Write a protein that binds this ligand. Structure first.
Ligand SMILES: Nc1ncnc2c1ncn2[C@@H]1O[C@H](COP(=O)(O)OP(=O)(O)OP(=O)(O)O)[C@@H](O)[C@H]1O
Ligand SMILES: Nc1ncnc2c1ncn2[C@@H]1O[C@H](COP(=O)(O)OP(=O)(O)OP(=O)(O)O)[C@@H](O)[C@H]1O
Ligand SMILES: [Mg+2]
Ligand SMILES: [Mg+2]
Lengths: 72, 34, 17, 214, 101, 262, 135, 87, 289, 290, 101
């Protein structure tokens, strides 16, 4: 429910599905076995009308198919 | 050994700095010049 | 107008529901 | 001995203020040894305390400086090397041009070693003669001539520091983005003296007409 | 003792809540001052004890304390508009020896 | 579980992207945030120092401001519309009669693309740059859709004036970032499409708009020729009259072949 | 020995009264050491006040001893200094005693101001201005 | 003077945050746009004379919730300096 | 006589403090909240033994974002573990703003004040607790009518306290028009001290463990060179340092930062560093074989 | 289950909270508080962020007889998500002074709810240890190659801490000690230097008497322990190596730096000696003038 | 240097202006800066090559601004007693000035 900012999606870039022993990340990290070290899952960078960008592990209720790389 | 000796000489020079330096400081608080 | 919330643009430029 | 251990806890206190996070300003000018004016790169001017036994020789000229992100105070400094516009390209990379791949413009070839090559090897040549060394070099002409190429020839040849900036790397994007990046390139060059600055084009920066309407 | 206990006094100084630089456009003799804040808007706002409106005057840069933008002290350096003209131009002075002949 | 997944994402917080502007020490880095202003930050141990280079995108924390991880390159939202342009595709010979111009186009574009090596023997600067000009309706652009389809190389494409912003030098940054993307990409074809107002001259007895033209133009000159010289990323420039263009956009050695399609 | 500040705060005064009006180095040593060495502000403040009580009798030595403590800019230390001089020189005033209090009316911390004002009036209770020009 | 200013300062700052008077509404409100870029649908205290203020006036808004605290008559522009005399 | 309200000081057990910080920073900038479990004894002591967090919302604090259903389940969880006492209030964390109650927060507080009058609101700033100070301030609502009658002086009777005002601006508005702020003391036991002070397993592994001796040679090289530059600067200064007025000499012959002082700090750090390092080498070499 | 582990990182909160819960069940004298352990895992480093009590009864007659209230554990976990949806079971804490053999049978029960082998974190309430007052084990089942059957056994891992910065300053705020077991000046690290050597003595004693206990009181000849002991000797120096001669050359080097640094300090203070004399020298005139 | 004037070099430029940004409103304010920083010299050197249509426009658009300056100057010998602000104008030849100057 309201209120909540409305932003645009820079991109979907996506970090690997979490079943790995070695993080879950496309861009691999130092240290041996990770899962919730600084490994997080599917990633969306969104660009705001608060004039910045943020990398989040996004909600899995909504698909990276329901995310376009320019979707509001 | 040689380095050990030099250091002690330096330390004793500090001690001689200490006894001399603060001794006349005390005297100026004691005397009237205010 | 979204049929049943609205998308406003503030005068702050910042867009909200 | 207590006062000594109490020093360590006091200095410790001050170290937490020093440590990150920080924000980056620029030091303008002093008004005291414990007060200065700083412009943040959040595009705001603050009159700010100057922390104890931090530089006051370098600090007084314009220079990057560390400020606290919440408190807003001068809590650390940043050297004239760091907080670059972009690093040197004359001791890290080397240009793709020398004067074995320059052909003509022999008339300008006599002129470019006067200006560039002779002050790097010994700036004192001009001074002991008693002639002033020229200031900046303008290269001008109809596009294609090899002006830009010539800079590369003498920068690869002399083998002292170089800086590749342009006017689209001083360009405004945020507030106080723009004035700051100009200042940044000269402070870099001075630290790694001597150095050659090339700003590739000023046809966007200096314009014979300004509207000054906006 | 002096060395260690100024540091304790200095933590207050370092943990200031911000400042700003303003310039006084004009006073108003209601005991308040019109300040065109330099990065910011215009606010008419209360003076401190340290300064007063007859010691405050137009084209004098001030320091403000961001507790409410409370005018604190005069700022020693202020802008001169003539220096804007002459500096951005850049023009030395000469004597009559550089017209000689 | 579909709603359980929603809780674990919701209780996480965001992160703020930067890029490594400059090493200060070894445990402190200067980043330039995507919110704008530069900060001084520390690092998590998970990121290695020698994977921290300058121009590498990092996460920061948004309450501690510390790198947790390296992030892939950022990329424009706009250039994801541009790879979604190749529609209007047609066969190798899809403009009839101007077939002689297709052959002439591939000399510059496709022959060094597959093998740059046949030009090593020859010894010339790798063929880069094409200007297309004609009276409208001759498929300067229809040809571009054919040479995107047939080769099957990475393709972009630019709207006319939708890569012109309201910020001077922000409309430079965008076009700068599509060139970078195109150099990361193998054999990329870069079509500038109907450049006629985004290639104007000096004017500036006009409005403030013509200084947006001028800022954005200077960016092209450095890219084409500087320490970037393209040998696998290719420039194709389409214009409707080739004296709308400033003569550094009519300068060969950035535009080696200037092809007229009549 | 108690790890409780309140029990230590009373401990200072327990010295004050056991060894009241005899200048014993042991009583005085424990107070001086606790005062400097502790981090719980009540305890430190108490300890200096205890000094004046031990040394009621030798009230002449007090300003020389406790000038050290007033020098420290810790608030509670300064506050405890003020009362101790108050206590020692209450019946008979000393010039030096009064001076150590004078920059404690010019300290900006008000707790230090409260103590110092009371101490000064404790030393100068019915003293006139042709008897002490500082009155 | 003394008792009138008590309740004058009640509804006055600290900051007095200049606005630009875009349009009036006749219910004791106006839409101002500030120099600092957020709009406010301001009230009007109703001692400064409700309709004595017109578009292009510069308005004093309160440090908290914005009411038109008062109204400044005259705000010296350098553009009427040119016309106006100095000699 | 009526009921008189007077000073209190909110004692945040070591446990309670870590939980608020952990929960609050983690959830920032979204608002975080939770209830404070504890007990009131005395008339000057609010003792908060524990806190927990109540589920976050993207409506932040609200009177209906408190959520009593969740409170009730949680209370029974403490009841079965024998830890329930009395909920002594609520805390909430403002993100990077100061400690002051929002207008909405005043009405959240008005609800808990009905249920127990001694309830507090504890406003936390987590992004400001990464200084050398932790910034936390406490409020407790006072009757609007009482403030009219001049009963803010009533709240400081029978001690001088440690009275100080750490924050004004929105704070002093809300105090004036609603609340009486409380100062904060910390409780902890002698057991808990030992737990807190201990933070390394390498306590006994740090004077037998050593750093690479290439790194030490680099360090000695760096140190000696730095003091060599500062000495030339000092030498320029001490060509005079003999004219009237210290301040004139400091400007003219740079005693800006005092190269005497500057050299002392640098000398003393590397000198102390080398004595440990030699001592570590000599212990291990002789003792181990 | 993760069968890969390396270290256990512990938040400070965990330790303190188990001591609080311990006194409020009023446990002592072989009645020991046991609660659940919450945190991150599927990670070689076990990162323990929080802990909570469970309703638990320990019989002191038999510790193989115990009560665990299983139903409560599911309800509590749903409220853990309310706080933060990234906390799950990764073991269980023990509050006792040391490891019990009834702890292996207890560990079985938490396997059901963990995606990682379950952790035993002994939170002492007497705060022993010369490092942290926590010992750490994780239960592993393995073949033993000594001719003995497959055990499930608690194998030791290092203990470390990961503290949030926000929390850590609360530790400093609370703590009024100026720290003598952590780095500081020369004297402070001079204690730290002696402290480490005295730590080695205590640890070195325990091995000697364990070895005596094996061949007279007949404790298992455990090859894995003794193998690490063989490597202690092989990694131990021998007098007359040119590496240990280089140590002599390297001693000279840093001591000489101290020697020059000591001279540098002596110079600087002799400047202040002369200053103060110039201050006395002026103040003779001022006194004489008055 | 000898008169003790501020030497203000003006060039018909808008670069020195970045708070009025046209030379047609920067006469009165330009004048008033010279009066504050009296005594003063406005060296309006008209080059008449600024722009590329403004010297077929009116023979120099600098000469257009100069006419403003000089028209003020018709009363400047009495306002507060006696010119301090000399307008020292300069040009390449006196014949390439309009005869209204
Ligand atoms: N005079 C020259 N002789 C040989 N090569 C030349 C000459 N001038 C330019 N070139 C070549 O043209 C290419 C680009 O030149 P560059 O863009 O560096 O400078 P420029 O000719 O001043 O261009 P412009 O003025 O059009 O921006 C290079 O490969 C360079 O070698
Ligand atoms: N050469 C052609 N053969 C077949 N269809 C054509 C041709 N030229 C144009 N068309 C038709 O017109 C449409 C739009 O023309 P298009 O944009 O390709 O022309 P253009 O020459 O690039 O013009 P401009 O110079 O104005 O951009 C095509 O997609 C196609 O449907
Ligand atoms: Mg060029
Ligand atoms: Mg087309």
């Amino acid at each position: 429910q309201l209120p909540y900012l409305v932003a645009n999606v820079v991109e979907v870039m996506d970090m690997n599905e979490i079943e790995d022993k070695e993080n879950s990340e496309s861009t691999t990290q130092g240290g041996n076995v990770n899962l919730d070290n600084t490994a997080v899952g599917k990633a969306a960078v969104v660009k705001t009308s608060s004039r910045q960008t943020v990398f989040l592990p996004m909600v899995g209720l909504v698909d990276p198919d329901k995310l376009k790389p320019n979707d509001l | 050994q040689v380095f050990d000796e030099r250091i002690k000489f330096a330390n004793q020079l500090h001690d001689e700095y200490l006894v001399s330096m603060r001794y006349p400081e005390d005297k100026k608080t004691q005397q009237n010049e205010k | 107008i979204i049929k049943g919330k609205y998308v406003i643009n503030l005068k702050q430029i910042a867009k909200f529901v | 001995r207590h006062l000594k251990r109490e020093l360590k806890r006091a200095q410790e206190e001050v170290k937490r203020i020093q440590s990150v996070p920080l924000v980056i300003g620029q030091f303008l000018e002093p008004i005291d040894q414990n007060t200065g004016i700083v412009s943040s790169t959040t595009g705001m001017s603050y009159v700010v305390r100057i922390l104890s036994t931090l530089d006051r020789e370098l600090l007084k000229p314009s220079m990057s400086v560390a400020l606290h992100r919440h408190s807003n105070a001068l809590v650390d400094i940043l050297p004239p090397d760091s907080d670059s516009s972009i690093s040197v390209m004359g001791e890290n990379e080397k240009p793709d041009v020398t004067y074995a791949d320059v052909g003509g413009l022999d008339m300008q070839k006599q002129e470019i070693r006067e200006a560039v090559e002779l002050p790097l090897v010994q700036a004192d040549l001009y001074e002991q003669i008693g002639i002033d060394p020229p200031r900046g070099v303008l290269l001008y002409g109809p596009p294609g001539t090899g002006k830009t190429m010539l800079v590369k020839a003498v920068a690869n040849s002399t083998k002292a520091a170089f800086i590749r900036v342009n006017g689209s790397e001083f360009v405004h994007k945020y507030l106080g983005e723009g004035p700051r990046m100009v200042r940044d390139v000269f402070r870099l060059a001075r630290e790694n003296a001597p150095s050659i600055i090339f700003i590739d084009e000023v046809d966007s920066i200096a314009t014979k007409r300004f509207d000054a309407q906006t | 003792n002096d060395k260690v206990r100024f540091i304790k006094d200095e933590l207050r100084l370092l943990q200031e809540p911000g400042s700003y630089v303003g310039e006084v456009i004009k006073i108003v003799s209601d005991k308040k001052v019109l300040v065109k804040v330099q990065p910011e808007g215009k606010y008419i706002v209360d003076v401190a004890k340290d300064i007063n409106v007859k010691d405050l005057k137009a084209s004098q840069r001030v320091c403000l304390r961001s507790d409410s933008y409370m005018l604190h002290k005069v700022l020693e350096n202020k802008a001169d508009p003539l220096v804007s003209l002459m500096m951005v131009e850049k023009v030395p002075d000469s004597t009559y020896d550089m017209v000689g002949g | 579980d579909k709603t359980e997944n929603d809780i674990k994402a919701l209780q996480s917080i965001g992160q703020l992207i930067g890029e490594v502007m400059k090493e200060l020490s070894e445990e402190k880095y200067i980043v330039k945030a995507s919110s704008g202003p530069r900060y001084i930050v520390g690092v998590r141990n998970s990121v290695d120092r020698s994977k921290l280079k300058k121009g590498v995108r990092v996460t920061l924390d948004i309450t501690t401001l510390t790198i947790m991880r390296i992030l892939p390159r950022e990329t424009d939202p706009l250039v994801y519309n541009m790879t979604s342009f190749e529609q209007g595709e047609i066969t190798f010979d899809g403009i009839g009669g101007l077939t002689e111009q297709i052959r002439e186009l591939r000399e510059v574009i496709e022959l060094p693309l597959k093998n740059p090596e046949i030009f090593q023997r020859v010894g010339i600067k790798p063929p880069k740059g094409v200007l297309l000009y004609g009276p409208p309706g001759t498929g300067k652009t229809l040809l571009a859709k054919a040479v995107a389809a047939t080769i099957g190389a990475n393709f972009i494409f630019s709207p006319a004036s939708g890569i012109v912003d309201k910020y001077i030098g922000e409309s430079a940054r965008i076009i700068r970032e599509m060139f970078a993307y195109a150099k990361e990409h193998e054999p990329c074809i870069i079509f500038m499409d109907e450049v006629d107002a985004i290639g104007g001259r000096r004017f500036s007895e006009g409005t403030s708009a013509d200084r947006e033209i001028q800022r954005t133009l200077m960016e092209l000159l450095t890219q084409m020729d500087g320490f970037d010289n393209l040998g696998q990323t290719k420039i194709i420039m389409a214009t409707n009259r080739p004296d709308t263009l400033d003569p550094a956009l009519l300068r060969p050695g950035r535009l080696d072949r200037k092809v007229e399609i009549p | 020995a108690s790890d409780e500040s309140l029990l230590r705060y009373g401990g200072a005064f327990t010295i004050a009264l056991a060894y009241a009006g005899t200048g014993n180095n042991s009583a005085v040593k424990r107070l001086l050491h606790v005062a400097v060495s502790d981090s719980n502000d009540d305890v430190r403040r108490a300890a200096v006040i205890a000094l004046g009580f031990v040394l009621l009798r030798d009230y002449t030595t007090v300003p020389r001893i406790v000038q050290l403590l007033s020098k420290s800019h810790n608030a509670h230390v300064r506050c405890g200094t003020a009362f101790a001089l108050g206590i020692a020189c209450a019946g008979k005033g000393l010039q030096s005693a009064i001076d150590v209090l004078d920059p404690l009316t010019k300290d900006p911390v008000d707790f230090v101001r409260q103590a110092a004002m009371i101490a000064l009036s404790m030393i100068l209770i019915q003293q006139t201005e042709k008897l002490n020009p500082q009155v | 003077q003394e008792e009138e200013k008590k309740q004058l300062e009640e509804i006055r700052g600290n900051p007095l945050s200049i606005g630009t008077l875009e349009e009036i509404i006749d219910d004791d409100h106006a839409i101002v746009t500030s120099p600092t870029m957020p709009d406010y649908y301001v009230s009007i205290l109703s001692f400064v004379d409700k309709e004595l203020l017109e578009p292009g006036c510069s308005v004093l808004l309160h440090h908290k919730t914005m009411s038109i605290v008062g109204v400044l008559q005259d705000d010296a522009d350098p553009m009427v300096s040119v016309m106006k005399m100095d000699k | 006589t009526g009921r008189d309200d007077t000073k209190e000081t909110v004692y945040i057990s070591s446990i309670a403090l870590l939980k608020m910080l952990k929960h609050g920073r983690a959830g920032v900038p979204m608002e975080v909240m939770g209830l404070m479990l504890g007990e009131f004894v005395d008339d000057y002591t609010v003792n908060v033994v524990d806190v927990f967090a109540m589920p976050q919302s993207g409506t932040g604090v609200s009177v209906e974002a408190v959520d009593d259903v969740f409170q009730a389940k949680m209370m029974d969880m403490l009841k079965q573990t024998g830890r329930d006492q009395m909920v002594v209030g609520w805390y909430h964390s403002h993100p990077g703003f100061g400690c002051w109650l929002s207008s909405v927060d005043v009405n959240t507080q008005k609800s808990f004040e009905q249920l127990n009058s001694r309830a507090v609101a504890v406003v936390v700033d987590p992004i400001q607790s990464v200084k050398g100070k932790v910034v936390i301030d406490a409020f407790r609502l006072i009757d609007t009518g009482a403030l009219i009658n001049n009963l803010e002086p009533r709240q400081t009777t029978s001690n001088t306290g440690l009275l100080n005002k750490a924050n004004i601006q929105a704070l002093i508005h809300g105090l004036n028009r609603h609340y009486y702020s409380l100062n904060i003391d910390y409780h902890k036991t002698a057991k808990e001290t030992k737990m807190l002070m201990n933070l390394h397993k390498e306590q006994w592994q740090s004077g037998l463990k050593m750093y690479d001796y290439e790194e030490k040679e680099e360090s000695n090289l760096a140190a000696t060179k730095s003091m060599v530059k500062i000495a030339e600067q000092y030498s320029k200064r001490i060509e005079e340092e003999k004219e009237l007025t210290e301040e004139e000499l400091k400007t003219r012959y740079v005693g800006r930062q005092d190269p005497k002082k500057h050299l002392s700090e640098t000398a003393d750090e590397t000198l102390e560093n080398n004595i440990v390092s030699v001592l570590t080498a000599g212990v291990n070499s002789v003792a181990i074989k | 289950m993760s069968l890969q582990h390396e270290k256990v990182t512990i938040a400070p909160l965990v330790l303190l909270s188990a001591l609080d819960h311990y006194e409020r069940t009023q446990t002592k004298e072989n009645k020991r508080c046991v609660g659940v352990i919450l945190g991150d895992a599927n990670s070689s480093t076990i990162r323990v962020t929080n802990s909570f009590a469970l309703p638990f009864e320990e019989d002191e007659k038999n510790s193989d007889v115990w009560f665990l209230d299983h139903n409560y554990i599911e309800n509590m976990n749903e409220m853990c998500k309310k706080i933060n949806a990234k906390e799950k079971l990764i073991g269980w804490y023990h509050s006792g002074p040391k490891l019990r053999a009834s702890d292996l049978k207890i560990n079985e029960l938490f396997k059901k709810y963990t995606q990682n082998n379950p952790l035993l974190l002994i939170v002492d309430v007497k705060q022993q240890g010369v490092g942290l007052p926590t010992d750490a084990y994780v239960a592993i089942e393995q073949v033993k190659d000594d001719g003995t059957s497959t055990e499930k056994t608690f194998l030791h891992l290092p203990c470390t801490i990961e503290a949030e910065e926000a929390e850590e300053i609360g530790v400093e705020h609370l703590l009024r000690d100026v720290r003598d077991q952590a780095a500081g000046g020369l004297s402070i690290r001079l204690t730290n230097q002696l402290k480490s050597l005295k730590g080695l003595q205590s640890k070195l004693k325990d091995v000697v008497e364990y070895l005596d206990k094996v061949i007279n009181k007949e404790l298992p000849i455990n090859h894995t322990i003794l193998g690490k002991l063989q490597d202690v000797f092989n990694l131990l120096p021998n007098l007359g190596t040119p590496d240990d001669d280089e140590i002599d050359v390297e001693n000279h080097d840093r001591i000489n730096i101290s020697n020059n640094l000591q001279k540098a300090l002596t110079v600087k203070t002799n400047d202040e000696l002369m200053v103060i004399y110039i201050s006395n020298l002026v103040r003779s005139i001022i006194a004489f003038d008055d | 240097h000898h008169t003790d004037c501020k030497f203000i070099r003006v060039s018909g430029a808008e670069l020195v202006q970045k708070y009025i940004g046209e030379g047609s409103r920067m006469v009165r304010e330009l004048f008033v800066m010279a009066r504050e920083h009296a005594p003063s010299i406005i060296f309006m050197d008209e080059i008449d090559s600024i722009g590329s249509t403004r010297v077929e426009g009116s023979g120099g658009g600098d000469s257009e601004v100069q006419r403003t300056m000089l028209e003020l100057l018709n009363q400047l010998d009495g306002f507060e007693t006696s010119k301090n602000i000399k307008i020292i104008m300069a040009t390449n030849r006196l014949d390439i000035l309009d005869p209204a100057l």
